[PDB]
């Protein structure tokens, strides 16, 4: 409700006047940190290659995880099948050689 030290708590953006802490809309937008912002940031939406590991809350943005057979901040890449000479694919890392 009330802006502590000019700032609103996580999951809130301060009102236009400066007196109120409006809450972020769950599913729509979020804020992660103590802030005096005019809006909450909109949730990330998942691309094709991806699934929604954690849905977007008010304190947390959405985690999209690359699907089975790929990895990642712009598009999911196909994993390197083999290693180069003289040298496991996850949803966030290539193969390590």
């Amino acid at each position: 409700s009330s802006p502590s030290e000019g700032l609103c708590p996580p999951g809130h953006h301060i009102s236009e006047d400066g007196r109120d802490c409006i809450s972020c809309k769950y599913g729509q937008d979020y804020s992660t940190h103590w802030n005096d912002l005019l809006f909450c940031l909109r949730c990330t939406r998942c691309d094709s290659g991806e699934v929604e590991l954690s849905p977007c809350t008010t304190t947390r943005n959405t985690v999209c995880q690359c699907e089975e057979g790929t990895f990642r901040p712009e598009m999911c890449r196909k994993c390197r099948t083999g290693c180069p000479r003289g040298m496991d694919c996850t949803p966030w890392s290539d193969i390590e050689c």
Partner: antibody
Amino acid sequence: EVQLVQSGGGVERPGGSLRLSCAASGFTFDDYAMSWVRQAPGKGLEWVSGINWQGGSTGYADSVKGRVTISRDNAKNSLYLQMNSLRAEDTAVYYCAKILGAGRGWYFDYWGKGTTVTVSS
Amino acid sequence: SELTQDPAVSVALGQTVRITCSGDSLRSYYASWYQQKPGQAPVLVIYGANNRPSGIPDRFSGSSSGNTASLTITGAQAEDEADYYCNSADSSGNHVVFGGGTKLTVLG
């Protein structure tokens, strides 16, 4: 540029079997995910099944789950959909479609000419 | 599951039209649009964010607020009287889902 040849416009009695085959040329095939997506006479598109670049991920629409099966032979740049125990509601045109990424997905950047399948009692 | 788009809309040649596609999973999965001229293979128009494959006109534009995606044609020409569908993943992430399609007529 990409090319996709479907084939085998089949007339089949209910409870019968088909094997839709799609071949693809003009792009690396094993780099990309695939999917079948259909459409009955003048009545909206409907996603059938999806496959991963490698062949691991395989997705099937409730309306077909267990009845059809999906598989690719990256050695022959081919992608199949075996059908088993057809339904009169499986009367559709079937488009094999290239999904844009390597992972199983919903952005079909290319669409074959599509094979017609008719199921009548 | 099921994202519902109006079955029929219209535009006067040279005007703008927005075809909206609505479904409680478009809150957490980017949209994607196709075009289907009577008896052609659907042709991908706008995949997610707002990026368009090489070869489709500038005129076209995808957008998203809340649980609605919206395809937008500016200055709709004669060669746009076609069916436009939308799709995302379902509520979970495993299935795909298509909009009931919109018959966009261009007013001749």
